[PDB]
Amino acid sequence: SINPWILTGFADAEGSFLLRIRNNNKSSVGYSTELGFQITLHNKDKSILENIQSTWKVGVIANSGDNAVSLKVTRFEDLKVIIDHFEKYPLITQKLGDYKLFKQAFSVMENKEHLKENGIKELVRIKAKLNWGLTDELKKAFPENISKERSLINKNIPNFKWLAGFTSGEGSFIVNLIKSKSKLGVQVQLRFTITQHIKDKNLMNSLITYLGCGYIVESNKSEFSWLTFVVTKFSDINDKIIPVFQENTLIGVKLEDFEDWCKVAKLIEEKKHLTESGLDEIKKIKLNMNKGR
DNA sequence: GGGTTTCCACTTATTCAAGTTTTTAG
DNA sequence: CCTAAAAACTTGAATAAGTGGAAACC
Ligand SMILES: [Ca+2]
Ligand SMILES: [Ca+2]
Numbered sequence: 001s002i003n004p005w006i007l008t009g010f011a012d013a014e015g016s017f018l019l020r021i022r023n024n025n026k027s028s029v030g031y032s033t034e035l036g037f038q039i040t041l042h043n044k045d046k047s048i049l050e051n052i053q054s055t056w057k058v059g060v061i062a063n064s065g066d067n068a069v070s071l072k073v074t075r076f077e078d079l080k081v082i083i084d085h086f087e088k089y090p091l092i093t094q095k096l097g098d099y100k101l102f103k104q105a106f107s108v109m110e111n112k113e114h115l116k117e118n119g120i121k122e123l124v125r126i127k128a129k130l131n132w133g134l135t136d137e138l139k140k141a142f143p144e145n146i147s148k149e150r151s152l153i154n155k156n157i158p159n160f161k162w163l164a165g166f167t168s169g170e171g172s173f174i175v176n177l178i179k180s181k182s183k184l185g186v187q188v189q190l191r192f193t194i195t196q197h198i199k200d201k202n203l204m205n206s207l208i209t210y211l212g213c214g215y216i217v218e219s220n221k222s223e224f225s226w227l228t229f230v231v232t233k234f235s236d237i238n239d240k241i242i243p244v245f246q247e248n249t250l251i252g253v254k255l256e257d258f259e260d261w262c263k264v265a266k267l268i269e270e271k272k273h274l275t276e277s278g279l280d281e282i283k284k285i286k287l288n289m290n291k292g293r
Numbered sequence: 294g295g296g297t298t299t300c301c302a303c304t305t306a307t308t309c310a311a312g313t314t315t316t317t318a319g
Numbered sequence: 320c321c322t323a324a325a326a327a328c329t330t331g332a333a334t335a336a337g338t339g340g341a342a343a344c345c
Contacts, residue, residue, distance in 0.1 A: 013309095013334095013335095014333095014334070014335075015335085016334095016335050016336055016337095017336095018336075018337075020337085020338090022338090022339095024296090024297090026295070026296060026297080027296070027297075028296070028297090032296095032297070032298085033297095033298095034298085034299080036299095038335085038336085038337095039334095039335090040333080040334060040335065040336085041333075041334075042332090042333055042334080045333095060299085060300065060301085062300080062301055062302075063301090063302080063303090064302090064303080064304095064334095065302090065303070065304080067332085067333080068333070068334075072300080072301095074298085074299060074300075075298090075299070075300095076298075076299090115296090115297080131335085131336060131337085132306095132336065132337080135337090169309095169334090170308095170309070170310075171310085172309095172310045172311060174310090174311070174312075176312085176313080176314095177313090178313090178314075178315085178323095179313095179314075179315090180321085180322075180323095181320080181321065181322090182320095182321060182322055182323095183321080183322090187322065187323070187324095189323075189324075189325095193310075193311090194310095195308080195309055195310060196308085196309080197307090197308060197309080215325085217326085217327085217328095219327085219328075219329095221307085221308095221329090221330090224307065224308070226307095226308065226309070228309095228310095230325085232323085232324055232325065232326095233323080233324065233325090234323075234324090274322080290311085290312085
């Protein structure tokens with residue numbers, strides 16, 4: 001049974017809402033619809049999706065390609081569990097807007113309005129602002145569509161449990177070995193990073209004040225830009241980052257990465273990272289986590 | 294029924310995580 | 320001199336988001 005707030009944090013990172021508007025000759029109005037919430041992780045973290053399934057008691061798990069496994073909740077009556085959960089523990093990223101559109105589509109389908117032409121039209125208005133919006137085909141079939149085009153979400157971190165769930169999806173624990181002019185010739189630097197699209201810049205900046213450390217770094221690969229929350233000072237890592245995730249446990253394979261990460265921190269704290277024997281020990285831990293776990 | 298729901302195999306763009314190297318700080 | 324901290328990126332795939340086909344409920 002996973003924590004309810006750890007779940008929303010994880011959903012804020014890996015979850016997504018789906019609204020299908022498909023042409024269907026067998027449908028009276030000519031369009032079939034599907035509404036649901038899904039998560040797609042690497043096969044290594046299939047354990048998470050099975051704990052979420054037991055926690056919610058809804059959804060179906062199926063392989064998504066050769067290296068991924070998904071958990072999709074399309075059973076309409078099951079969506080009441082999704083809605084019930086996200087009302088008590090709401091999302092805080094821009095995905096909350098997707099959820100809000102998700103509820104609107106839900107009410108339209110609950111009243112069976114999606115089986116008449118009017119309901120389909122309102123679904124096209126809802127889907128126009130959801131995720132990547134309307135497809136070229138949909139946009140051509142409904143050229144006279146309009147709507148509010150969604151409002152911007154601006155919330156901040158609720159509690160630590162949400163952070164543990166969000167870090168379990170977007171966090172990264174790195175042991176950076178730097179070719180240094182030190183006696184050993186190798187500096188051991190611990191780095192904790194959270195990466196998120198620039199759409200949630202305000203939430204990313206709040207990490208510094210919320211955690212009392214770190215800095216924001218923007219990057220970009222041509223037309224795409226993202227933000228990274230970085231913590232490299234050991235005192236902040238050993239006194240701020242580590243304690244938070246010890247009391248607020250992570251989930252998935254990243255908990256194993258975080259555990260080896262703390263092992264290296266124990267060596268640094270004892271200053272054994274400056275001994276040739278200690279440096280060799282940290283080099284072995286890095287290989288055990290770069291490959292897996 | 295057969296219109297509508299539900300589920301499973303599968304595809305695709307990019308937002309992520311993971312990684313290395315060089316420079317400045319103290 | 321020397322160790323820590325930050326800078327400044329690069330990389331490719333685990334994501335998010337989506338599509339195709341169809342069994343089978345109610
Ligand atoms: Ca995400
Ligand atoms: Ca992840």
